[PDB]
Amino acid sequence: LPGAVPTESIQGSTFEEKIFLQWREPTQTYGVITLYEITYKAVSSFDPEIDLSNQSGRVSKLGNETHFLFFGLYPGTTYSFTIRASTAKGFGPPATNQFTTKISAPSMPAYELETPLNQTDNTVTVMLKPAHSRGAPVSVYQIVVEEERPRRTKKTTEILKCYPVPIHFQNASLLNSQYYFAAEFPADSLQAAQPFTIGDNKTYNGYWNTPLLPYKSYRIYFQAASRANGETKIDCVQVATKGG
Ligand SMILES: *[C@@H]1O[C@H](CO[C@@H]2O[C@@H](C)[C@@H](O)[C@@H](O)[C@@H]2O)[C@@H](O[C@@H]2O[C@H](CO)[C@@H](O[C@@H]3O[C@H](CO)[C@@H](O)[C@H](O)[C@@H]3O)[C@H](O)[C@H]2NC(C)=O)[C@H](O)[C@H]1NC(C)=O
């Protein structure tokens, strides 16, 4: 029977849903290694919403090549790996270490550009719903109001992307940004579906929520962010349009 893999050789390069785990063979060969058997057990997570008991599993990595790409993992989560080496006559002792998947952006609610709850010359009111954590808690919500320039083509030069750079309304004209952040909430607001009024003129976390100009065409996105380990990740979804 073979020795164990040296615990200190086990290293992992980690992603949102994958961990590439890598090690070195046991210190001296009793006999040829035929497979490594690996258990991964979900240890802990920054996500408040998932039950980890079902997230564990086993890998019988056939063959004696010393790495494996773990797949389908859950983000923001620490997995403990136990590696056993096997001579054809049986396993060596286990060695074990743990690594953590990186967090991912929260998953927004589904929107279909339903006609808003009410609309005026200066305001639009829409029903917001809480986003779900996927790897880390939702930290803040942000609301993006974006002006439409006149266009002569549908086509885009590049992929559609969200808004990581916040901008207060009063600075957009100076900075020539196409959008402004109308509001930000701590995510303890919007724990259940409740309407929100674009342009209600009140200030949320330092963002003024400027009323809209009726001769301007606008589209509004609802965005959410999650934070851990200095990585902070966002997603956004368009909730309404206005023109006049
Ligand atoms: C990892 O595995 C390789 C592959 O060996 C093959 O796969 C194993 C999982 C077992 O099923 C083995 O029974 C099987 O041979 C080992 O490397 C080298 O593989 C070659 C090809 O099979 C072996 O070749 C033979 O060796 C004999 C003796 O020298 C010659 O007379 C033959 O002509 C033939 O070429 C070779 O033995 C094998 N090398 C060694 C040192 O065993 C590899 O060693 C193994 N490593 C570990 C750490 O497990």
Numbering used by the authors: 481 to 724
Reproduce passages from the article:
Type IIB receptor protein tyrosine phosphatases are cell surface transmembrane proteins that engage in cell adhesion via their extracellular domains (ECDs) and cell signaling via their cytoplasmic phosphatase domains. The four human R2B RPTPs (PTPRK, PTPRM, PTPRT, and PTPRU) are type 1 transmembrane proteins and share a common extracellular domain (ECD) architecture of one MAM (meprin/A5/μ), one immunoglobulin (Ig)-like, and four fibronectin (FN) type-III domains, with the most membrane proximal FN domain undergoing furin cleavage in the secretory pathway. Previous studies have shown that PTPRK, PTPRM, and PTPRT form homodimers, but not heterodimers, in cell aggregation assays. The homophilic (trans) interactions of R2B RPTPs determine their subcellular localization and have been proposed to function as spacer clamps between cell membranes.
Crystals grew in two space groups, P212121 and P3221, possessing two and four molecules per asymmetric unit, respectively. All six chains are essentially identical in structure (pairwise RMSDs over 220 Cα atoms range from 0.44 to 0.92 Å). The main difference between the protein structures is that one chain in the P212121 crystal has a disordered loop (residues 628–641) that in all other chains was ordered via intermolecular interactions. This loop is anchored at one end via a disulfide bond within the FN4 domain (C642 to C716), and the sequence encompasses the furin-cleavage site of PTPRM, illustrating that this site is surface accessible within a conformationally dynamic loop, but that cleavage would not significantly destabilize the fold of the FN4 domain. In both crystal forms, one chain is missing the glycan on N598, indicating that PTPRM-FN4 not only adopts conformational differences in the furin-cleavage loop but also can undergo heterogeneous glycosylation. Although the previous structure of the PTPRM ECD had no interpretable electron density for the FN4 domain, it was present in the construct. Superposition of the FN3 domains from our structure with this previous PTPRM structure demonstrates that the FN4 domain can be accommodated without significant steric clashes with surrounding chains, and FN4 colocalizes with weak and disconnected electron density that is unmodeled in the deposited structure.
